[PDB]
Structure prediction request, 765 residues.
Amino acid sequence: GYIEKLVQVNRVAKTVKGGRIFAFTALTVVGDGKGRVGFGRGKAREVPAAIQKAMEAARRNMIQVDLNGTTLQYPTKSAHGASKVYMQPASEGTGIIAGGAMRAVLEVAGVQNVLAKCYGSTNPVNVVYATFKGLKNMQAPEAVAAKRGKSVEEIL
Amino acid sequence: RTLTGRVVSDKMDKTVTVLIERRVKHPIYGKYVKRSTKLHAHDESNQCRIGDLVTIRETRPLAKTKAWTLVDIVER
Amino acid sequence: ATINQLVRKPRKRMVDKSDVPALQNCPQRRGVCTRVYTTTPKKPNSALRKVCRVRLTNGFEVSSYIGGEGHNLQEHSVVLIRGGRVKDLPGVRYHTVRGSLDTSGVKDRKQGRSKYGAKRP
Amino acid sequence: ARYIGPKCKLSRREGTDLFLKSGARALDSKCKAENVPGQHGQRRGRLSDYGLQLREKQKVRRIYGVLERQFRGYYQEASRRKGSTGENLLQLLECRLDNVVYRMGFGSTRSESRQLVSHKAITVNGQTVNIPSYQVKAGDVVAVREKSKNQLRIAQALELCGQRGRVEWVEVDLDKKAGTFKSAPARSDLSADINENLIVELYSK
Amino acid sequence: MVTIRLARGGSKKRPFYHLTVTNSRNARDGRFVERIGFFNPVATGGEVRLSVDQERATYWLGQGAQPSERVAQLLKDA
Amino acid sequence: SMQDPLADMLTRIRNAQMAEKTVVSMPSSKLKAAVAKVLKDEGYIADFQISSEVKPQLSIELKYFEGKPVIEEVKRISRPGLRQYKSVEQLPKVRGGLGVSIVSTNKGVMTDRAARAAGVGGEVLCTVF
RNA sequence: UAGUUGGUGGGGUAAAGGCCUACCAAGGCGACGAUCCGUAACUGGUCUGAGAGGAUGAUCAGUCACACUGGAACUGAGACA
RNA sequence: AACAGAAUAAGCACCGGCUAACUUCGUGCCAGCAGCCGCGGUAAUACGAAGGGUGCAAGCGUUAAUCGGAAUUACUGGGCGUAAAGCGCGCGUAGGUGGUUCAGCAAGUUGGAUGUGAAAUCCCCGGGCUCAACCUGGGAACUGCAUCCAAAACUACUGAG
Prediction:
């Protein structure tokens, strides 16, 4: 589906000769409010056209996320580049408390109780990779129990 | 209350000196160091050798800096 | 570093020092003034800043800065200085409270009067 | 310190009904609630992300009439109690005495209920209370003092109860004027325009 | 001597005493051996005025503890 | 001169599940032969064999539910030179109770779910997911 | 570092001790930081921190140290007041 | 409890970006501003004013001083091919770490009991002042240290291979 959310806008450039050609980039994540997200990056020549391009690439190559219901399954920790990310599920009344670019991922996924923090280099185009290695590699235990459930899930 | 150490000195008169090892843990780094302890056990009969393995206990002070005594020699 | 090195030489946290070295742990300080220069700023500006030099009750001889729009500050007059680092001028590290002892504030000012010390009309 | 001044102007910036004017005459006829106040009431665009959370916090804080020194005091008692600080923050604003006088219907505005408490005209357990912060419990028999039962401020306001209904955690008696706070409210009688997941997140950073 | 006497806690014009057993040459609010009860003169509603425990008062008074003037009656009125 | 044997059994397991091997053979001991019994009962390997006479070996067969293996990570906790000991209160839980943690207690080498039922603390060894 | 570190004999004090003295002996401590320099009354606690920690010891409470500066004893249950 | 009458009682910083909230008028590299980026050379949403607006309120602002943010002294929680960072290379004392079978022991380790860890403070459930601050009853906690009892997987010590 489609619920859109913008994060970043830049002004990249390019020197040719004579002057300097400008261009705009944008980063936009799209989710469904249930656990299907997708991010997208587009470059164009103006703001109202660079956002439209980044929205279209978001709703291609999406991710199914197996959330527990407004929370996560377990504390995990993933990294990409020089960016390290930590996330652990929380109680009911606590909302989402994260920084800038992990709120926009964790809104549209539908989770509400995420309690996150990012270390290392804060790059909004690169902390998103650090988040999607984490969420796309969840497990959601298909087991008979948890304190007993290590005889039917390990064979899954 | 009863300790155990090994003798390093026979130079003084009726006075012996022990080493009592000890493993205390470091308070913040979680590792067991070894830090020593050196007492003056009151010898009584001038008959212990450098390198023994003896046993001490605490009495009232006999001279200054000498309040421990000798229980018995355990092994040579 | 391994654990068996930190036991032998633990991590010693480095310390800073005060950007206001005079007026040792106190918010204000008085002093009598000596000279009223009018110096020039650094390169990317163009102005003529007004700088007085003060001898405190500590005995220190430090330059200061005077704000506002016009000052009555003839020499040998007491002031009351406070901290504040002017980025423009070099060596200037202290402002000067208006309206406190001798500087007597400014006049015809109606925006932000608790700064610079102006009354209410 | 209260807030004394214009009152459409608060409803005119946040862009909602907000229930501040007294009568059932008309919204947006005394008010003209089409625009942001001030001179530049026509230009708009892109409320900031911090500015959205402050806009939600300032909305809830102007329905009820608190100030921020008091409002953070309720936020500490929310995080003390067990579970769901968003719901607990609302139920400490529902049990307050100036709200329950408004829920029983002894006033038109909520600011009228603050004045009826302040002039000692309201009792709680059979004894006089003149504090607009009194946290009432389950089963407190709020009644009206006999010296002022003849005020037209109370009599007229009961015809303004017709456009309100009963909130189904109180009960009011239109003869002796003695309401009964039945129990705590649930998280269904409160409107969905307020959000319990923006005020909690504002007080982190 | 050792003695059983009254401390003083609470705000202005609302006292709340404490049956302590102290050495005699101490302060009022200073050190004590132990504490055994309280005394609340302005007790109203669900509050209890006298709350002395008879076990330790059996113990100390048999070993030469010397009570005060108010404590001469508060142990009596139990 | 290898200083720690049990961080070498776990290293060969982690490496063989990237070369997509099936059988792994390392030298044995009376502790490694008890750890692999615990990983079998929890279920991460197929079986194990102590089959020699004077250099007794340990032949472990690995599982693959997918192209991805069944063990995804494993790390040694009580490395020689740290010696991590835990009581029952401060005993850790991995992944909200979905991994296993192997604790050498007074009643033999058992997992974290077993000793916490018996109320016996001890020494952690590893945190297998 | 030479009553310095032990031993012996005698004194001295409510009380063990180089506490003191007479001879004997040449020991004792130290890189696990002695010695020396610079600063500072310690503690239960306060202030931040998710936590680990980090700073800090106003009011209240416990302990120590002084009573213009430097000494000194008496009286006495108990002071070097 | 009664009487008087709406009478007796509102400021302060900010509005270019971080950062909630804006346009005209003076000024023209002058005066001036400033926590950092930096504005001012004749049209200044940054200086000085005027309307408007936003934050807080019997207070609001600046300065001084600590801890956070700082995974920026990293035990929990970092690094060393080129960004700062591997001694010019050896040998070796103190010290740190120890292949594999049994057997013993119980110093570490785990579990339990007792003595202690002053009262206050913090935390939890209550109770009193019209509410709250404040006062106060009962519990937990004070991570500790010591003495006993038991267990024996791993480390240590001991005996044999």
Notes: The two ends of chain C are 67 Å apart (CA to CA). Residues 31 and 57 of chain C are 6 Å apart (CA to CA). Chain C is about 5% helix and 30% strand. The longest strand of chain C covers residues 28-39.
